[PDB]
Every structure is written in structure tokens, then in C-alpha cells.
Amino acid sequence: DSCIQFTRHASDVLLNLNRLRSRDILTDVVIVVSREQFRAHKTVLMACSGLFYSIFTDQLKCNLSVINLDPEINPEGFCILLDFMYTSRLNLREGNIMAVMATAMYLQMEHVVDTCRKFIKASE
Amino acid sequence: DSCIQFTRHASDVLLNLNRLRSRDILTDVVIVVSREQFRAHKTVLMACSGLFYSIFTDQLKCNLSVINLDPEINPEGFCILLDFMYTSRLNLREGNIMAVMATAMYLQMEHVVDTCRKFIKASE
Amino acid sequence: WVIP
Amino acid sequence: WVIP
Ligand SMILES: N#Cc1c(Cl)ncnc1Nc1ccc2c(c1)CC(=O)N2
Ligand SMILES: N#Cc1c(Cl)ncnc1Nc1ccc2c(c1)CC(=O)N2
Ligand SMILES: [Cl-]
Ligand SMILES: [Cl-]
Ligand SMILES: [Cl-]
Ligand SMILES: [Cl-]
Incomplete structure (x- = not known):
């Protein structure tokens, strides 16, 4: 068009x-x-x-x-992801990354799972 | 944050x-x-x-x-604006600009009214 | 506004 | 992903 x-x-x-x-x-x-x-x-x-x-x-x-x-x-993992859904902003921290990734896997939010995997791999 | x-x-x-x-x-x-x-x-x-x-x-x-x-x-003016709402794409044409602008004014969609005014001013 |  |  x-x-x-x-x-x-x-x-x-x-x-x-x-x-x-x-x-x-x-x-x-x-x-x-x-x-x-x-x-x-x-x-x-x-x-x-x-x-x-x-x-x-x-x-x-x-x-x-x-x-x-x-x-x-x-619940905190869910809260962080719900905020991401409504803002495009992900509050990813060392203290919450495991919970955020597990919640994103369950919710089927592939791009979040991807950045969590990358941040985890960088720290090992 | x-x-x-x-x-x-x-x-x-x-x-x-x-x-x-x-x-x-x-x-x-x-x-x-x-x-x-x-x-x-x-x-x-x-x-x-x-x-x-x-x-x-x-x-x-x-x-x-x-x-x-x-x-x-x-209705066509409304249809074009409803499509814009759901896509960010405005099908603005010489044949519909007056209807689109009048509909955008009624719906209170300031950015659409702004581009319609600018396109009209360029043609005069 | 841009040409997409 | 970016630093906003
Ligand atoms: N609402 C809607 C919807 C529709 Cl209509 N079509 C296609 N996907 C939709 N949503 C949806 C499906 C799968 C996934 C996501 C969103 C993010 C992700 O990582 N996986
Ligand atoms: N929903 C919602 C909403 C809220 Cl929550 N807060 C503020 N504006 C909201 N929406 C809204 C109000 C005024 C105008 C537009 C959108 C586009 C425009 O040109 N004028
Ligand atoms: Cl119920
Ligand atoms: Cl995602
Ligand atoms: Cl009703
Ligand atoms: Cl608008």
C-alpha cells in the first residue's frame, strides 16, 4: 500500500x-x-x-x-513479566533471573527466555 | 531503574x-x-x-x-482510522483526506489531525 | 510520520 | 534487547 x-x-x-x-x-x-x-x-x-x-x-x-x-x-517472577508485557521493560537482576526465566518458559515468552539464557551463560 | x-x-x-x-x-x-x-x-x-x-x-x-x-x-474515514489504531499505518489519499481529518477531529486523534493539516497545506 |  |  x-x-x-x-x-x-x-x-x-x-x-x-x-x-x-x-x-x-x-x-x-x-x-x-x-x-x-x-x-x-x-x-x-x-x-x-x-x-x-x-x-x-x-x-x-x-x-x-x-x-x-x-x-x-x-509471584515476583510473574510480576516482573507482567510489567514487561505492559511496558517492554524487563527488570532482570542476579537475584531474580532464575525465577524470571522459569516463569517466561511457563508463560511461553521466547524473547525473555532468550535474554535470560544469554545473561546466565555470560556469568558462568 | x-x-x-x-x-x-x-x-x-x-x-x-x-x-x-x-x-x-x-x-x-x-x-x-x-x-x-x-x-x-x-x-x-x-x-x-x-x-x-x-x-x-x-x-x-x-x-x-x-x-x-x-x-x-x-464509514470509510472511520475504517481507515480504526486500521491506523491497530497498525500505526494511515492510508491517507487525496480522495479520503477530508473525511479522515474530520473523523480524526471527532475521535480526538491529534497526531492524525496534524498530518492531515500538513498534507492539505502542501496542496494549496 | 514516515514512509514505512 | 537494549539499555533504554
Ligand atoms: N494474541 C495473540 C497471538 C496471535 Cl493472535 N497470534 C499469534 N501469537 C499470539 N500471541 C502469542 C503466541 C505465542 C507467543 C507469544 C504471543 C509470545 C511468545 O514468545 N510466544
Ligand atoms: N486509554 C487511555 C488513555 C489514558 Cl489511560 N490516559 C491518557 N490518554 C488515554 N487515551 C487517549 C486520550 C486522549 C487522546 C488519545 C488517547 C490520542 C489523542 O490524540 N488524544
Ligand atoms: Cl471464574
Ligand atoms: Cl517475549
Ligand atoms: Cl448496548
Ligand atoms: Cl493519533
């Missing part, structure tokens, strides 16, 4: 989706990770995670308002 | 939101523009448009599944 493109559009959309999340506006699911709960938008979760894409395209699970993650999933 | 950032994340999220829209997955509103209907995600509309941000933060309108636009709004 003969379209023009607004460079910052995708980033501005994501910034606004994060603002809606912070104000709990039109959030439609709560992700339970052991004793912790995280409110989010199903569409954003599906757009970032192979696991959520599978869950919310399921004819029964698409209608659930609560999703319980595997008890082995670390 | 000490975060790392994935450059393509925002663009990949938007590409997936557009794929969900094309397959009518978790779309939660229909925008009626005279004889035409457009299915979309309320969160994406709010993230792109001052008008939709106002509508869906309203305590009564947030729950509506159908929104009827002003009868002066051109």
Missing part, C-alpha cells in the same frame, strides 16, 4: 494500556499466583504469552474471570 | 491485537457508523482516541456493547 506510519504509535498504545491497568480500567481477569493476585487485560496477556494465547482462545477458559497458575510459579 | 528493553515488543503486541481483531477474538464492542458496523476492543479504542477514552471511562457507557457515532461520520 501507499500508507504513512506514525513511529511512536505502538509505544503510545502500550503506555495507555499500562495506564488503564494501573487504574484497574476494563481489566477482565485476575491471575492468581499462590497468595498473590494480579489484575490484567486478557487481550494484552494473549498478545505477549503463548500460554495466555492458548488459554483465552479456549471455548470454556475464554469466559473465566480468574486463572490460577501452577503453584511452582514465583 | 536498571531494566533492559525489547525494542520490537510494542509493535509485536499491536500486531497480535490486530490479529485478534481480524479473527473477532475477545472483541467487546461494535461501533456503528451509519449503515456500517465495526467490531473492536474497547481498550485499544481508548488507548488511541480521546473520544473513546472519555466514552469507556464513563460509569454507564463503559458497559455498552454498541456505540453509535454521529451520522455525519464517514
Whole structure:
């Protein structure tokens, strides 16, 4: 086509989706990770995670308002990844890298798994 | 913070939101523009448009599944802008620029209004 | 705005 | 991945 493109559009959309999340506006699911709960938008979760894409395209699970993650999933690891989904920013630290990588593998977030593997290999 | 950032994340999220829209997955509103209907995600509309941000933060309108636009709004103009919202690509042409600009003014999409004004000024 |  |  003969379209023009607004460079910052995708980033501005994501910034606004994060603002809606912070104000709990039109959030439609709560992700339970052991004793912790995280409110989010199903569409954003599906757009970032192979696991959520599978869950919310399921004819029964698409209608659930609560999703319980595997008890082995670390809440801080999940929190860091949920923040990444809404911002493109990953708070990767020596103290959380193992939990972040395990959570990214479970959530099926290949690019996060890739940078975790690379950061781990550099430290060995 | 000490975060790392994935450059393509925002663009990949938007590409997936557009794929969900094309397959009518978790779309939660229909925008009626005279004889035409457009299915979309309320969160994406709010993230792109001052008008939709106002509508869906309203305590009564947030729950509506159908929104009827002003009868002066051109469906093709709306279609071009809805595509822009989900892709960052604006199909701006001599034959549609007036309708696109009027629709962008109504929807409160300042960056689109700005490029339309500039393209119009260049042709006079 | 750019030519993509 | 980059340093933002
Ligand atoms: N929503 C949506 C969606 C669609 Cl529509 N099409 C294709 N992928 C989608 N999302 C999704 C699927 C697999 C993975 C990711 C996202 C990130 C990753 O590492 N794996
Ligand atoms: N959703 C959301 C949203 C939030 Cl949370 N905060 C601030 N603006 C939001 N969206 C929004 C408001 C005004 C305009 C646009 C988008 C594009 C434009 O030209 N004007
Ligand atoms: Cl439920
Ligand atoms: Cl990823
Ligand atoms: Cl309704
Ligand atoms: Cl805009």
C-alpha cells in the first residue's frame, strides 16, 4: 500500500494500556499466583504469552474471570513479566533471573527466555 | 531503574491485537457508523482516541456493547482510522483526506489531525 | 510520520 | 534487547 506510519504509535498504545491497568480500567481477569493476585487485560496477556494465547482462545477458559497458575510459579517472577508485557521493560537482576526465566518458559515468552539464557551463560 | 528493553515488543503486541481483531477474538464492542458496523476492543479504542477514552471511562457507557457515532461520520474515514489504531499505518489519499481529518477531529486523534493539516497545506 |  |  501507499500508507504513512506514525513511529511512536505502538509505544503510545502500550503506555495507555499500562495506564488503564494501573487504574484497574476494563481489566477482565485476575491471575492468581499462590497468595498473590494480579489484575490484567486478557487481550494484552494473549498478545505477549503463548500460554495466555492458548488459554483465552479456549471455548470454556475464554469466559473465566480468574486463572490460577501452577503453584511452582514465583509471584515476583510473574510480576516482573507482567510489567514487561505492559511496558517492554524487563527488570532482570542476579537475584531474580532464575525465577524470571522459569516463569517466561511457563508463560511461553521466547524473547525473555532468550535474554535470560544469554545473561546466565555470560556469568558462568 | 536498571531494566533492559525489547525494542520490537510494542509493535509485536499491536500486531497480535490486530490479529485478534481480524479473527473477532475477545472483541467487546461494535461501533456503528451509519449503515456500517465495526467490531473492536474497547481498550485499544481508548488507548488511541480521546473520544473513546472519555466514552469507556464513563460509569454507564463503559458497559455498552454498541456505540453509535454521529451520522455525519464517514464509514470509510472511520475504517481507515480504526486500521491506523491497530497498525500505526494511515492510508491517507487525496480522495479520503477530508473525511479522515474530520473523523480524526471527532475521535480526538491529534497526531492524525496534524498530518492531515500538513498534507492539505502542501496542496494549496 | 514516515514512509514505512 | 537494549539499555533504554
Ligand atoms: N494474541 C495473540 C497471538 C496471535 Cl493472535 N497470534 C499469534 N501469537 C499470539 N500471541 C502469542 C503466541 C505465542 C507467543 C507469544 C504471543 C509470545 C511468545 O514468545 N510466544
Ligand atoms: N486509554 C487511555 C488513555 C489514558 Cl489511560 N490516559 C491518557 N490518554 C488515554 N487515551 C487517549 C486520550 C486522549 C487522546 C488519545 C488517547 C490520542 C489523542 O490524540 N488524544
Ligand atoms: Cl471464574
Ligand atoms: Cl517475549
Ligand atoms: Cl448496548
Ligand atoms: Cl493519533
